[PDB]
Design a protein around this ligand. Structure first.
Ligand SMILES: [Zn+2]
Length: 416
């Protein structure tokens, strides 16, 4: 959320909110300079060649093997100035999101969504799960383990393939059992996508469709919504997909969209999800939350040196909005759960963010992007926390001209 400290990539490491870190990996990675921009949230201005071993290089695939919807440049985010700009761009997008009442709530939910301490083999012992932490290097090369909820990191080979990912477990399905896990968002504020939209009020579209660019704040908000679902362990299995049926015959015949994506987008898209299937999920996760309250009730010991058992129990009472009786026992109140669940799944949506930002955006998740543009959101003359590209007191604040790649062509450089 709000970043109450000016961060310059060049600032010296202080081992607190500026330091070199290592994430739970398979290959002995070399540490990277990271910045803690807010409680539980870090930003790593580096291309992601760490989280997944299979993706340990920025080498682009054969020209004729890379999809039409992609962009490669192994040179992007390699210099200090680029990293500084990346850091400033990410910080600025967080502030824009935070400036909205919806954004402030989402970020507050993310910070409160500490991954559950379900790593013990003993059902009466609370223990942190190692992959929900990072290792912060100390002056003596030593490492300090620190819990965190979210990491914003640079994209891997395909620069426009933004996604929210996290480390799995041997048996637990952390993003779907109510526990949650630390989320890593591959993202860049230096590029955006173009889409077609007709603002024509009349009935004479005899000249085509307008060419606009997606506001990066909306794109980040979209990934943060996924992070929210995953931090609270209520993400829908990616295998549960949908084959558009406004007009369908039998056994597919066109592209497909996942339920998780449709839910995250919101609007008419989410309205397609059967109210029955919706309640099925709600009751399922209601019970997962009950199992968590039960685990906390049975806890008799805790691993670690800093936090006491009562301290962590309080952390999770707050996260899951559990009710506590005089005996100190926890329970899940149906009403409270329904409210939290609705907040995370129906209120926090891309469509609702577009409403709060008052910007132009794809009307449907199905509206495929047409191109990729190079941008620079850092300078105040190009983009601001409150108006984005549509600068008030200027022509750009009229008819979303600021997002119009034709009109505001100086802010969008086509790359593909
Ligand atoms: Zn998505």
């Amino acid at each position: 959320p709000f970043v109450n400290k000016q961060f310059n990539y060049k600032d010296p490491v202080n081992g607190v909110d500026i330091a070199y870190i290592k994430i739970p990996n398979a290959g002995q990675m070399q540490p990277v300079k990271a910045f803690k921009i807010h409680n539980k949230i870090w930003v790593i201005p580096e291309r992601d060649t760490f989280t997944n071993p299979e993706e340990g290089d920025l080498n682009p695939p054969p020209e004729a093997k890379q999809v039409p919807v992609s962009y490669y440049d192994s040179t992007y985010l390699s210099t200090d100035n680029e990293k500084d700009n990346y850091l400033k761009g990410v910080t600025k997008l967080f502030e824009r999101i935070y400036s909205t009442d919806l954004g402030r709530m989402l970020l507050t939910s993310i910070v409160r969504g500490i991954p559950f301490w379900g790593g013990s083999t003993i059902d009466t012992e609370l223990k942190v799960i190692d992959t929900n932490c990072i290792n912060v290097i100390q002056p003596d090369g030593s490492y300090r383990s620190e819990e965190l909820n979210l990491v914003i990191i640079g994209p891997s080979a395909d620069i426009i393939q933004f996604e929210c990912k996290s480390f799995g477990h041997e048996v637990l399905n952390l993003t779907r059992n109510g526990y949650g896990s630390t989320q890593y968002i591959r993202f860049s504020p230096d590029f955006t996508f173009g889409f077609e939209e007709s603002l024509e009020v009349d009935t004479n579209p005899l000249l085509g469709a307008g060419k606009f660019a997606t506001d990066p704040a909306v794109t980040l908000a979209h990934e943060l919504i996924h992070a929210g679902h995953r931090l609270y362990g209520i993400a829908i299995n990616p295998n549960r997909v949908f084959k558009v049926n406004t007009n369908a015959y039998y056994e597919m015949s066109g592209l497909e969209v996942s339920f998780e994506e449709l839910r995250t987008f919101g609007g008419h898209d989410a309205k397609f999800i059967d109210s029955l299937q919706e309640n099925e999920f709600r009751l399922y996760y209601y019970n997962k939350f009950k199992d968590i309250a039960s685990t906390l009730n049975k806890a008799k010991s805790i691993v670690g040196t800093t936090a006491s058992l009562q301290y962590m129990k309080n952390v999770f009472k707050e996260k899951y909005l559990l009710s506590e009786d005089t005996s100190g026992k926890f329970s899940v109140d149906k009403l409270k759960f329904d409210k939290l669940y609705k907040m995370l799944t129906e209120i926090y949506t891309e469509d609702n963010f577009v409403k709060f930002f008052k910007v132009l955006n794809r009307k449907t998740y199905l509206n495929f992007d047409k191109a990729v543009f190079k941008i620079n959101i850092v300078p105040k003359v190009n983009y601001t926390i409150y108006d984005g590209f549509n600068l008030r007191n200027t022509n750009l604040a009229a008819n979303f001209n600021g997002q119009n790649t034709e009109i505001n062509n100086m802010n969008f450089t086509k790359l593909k």
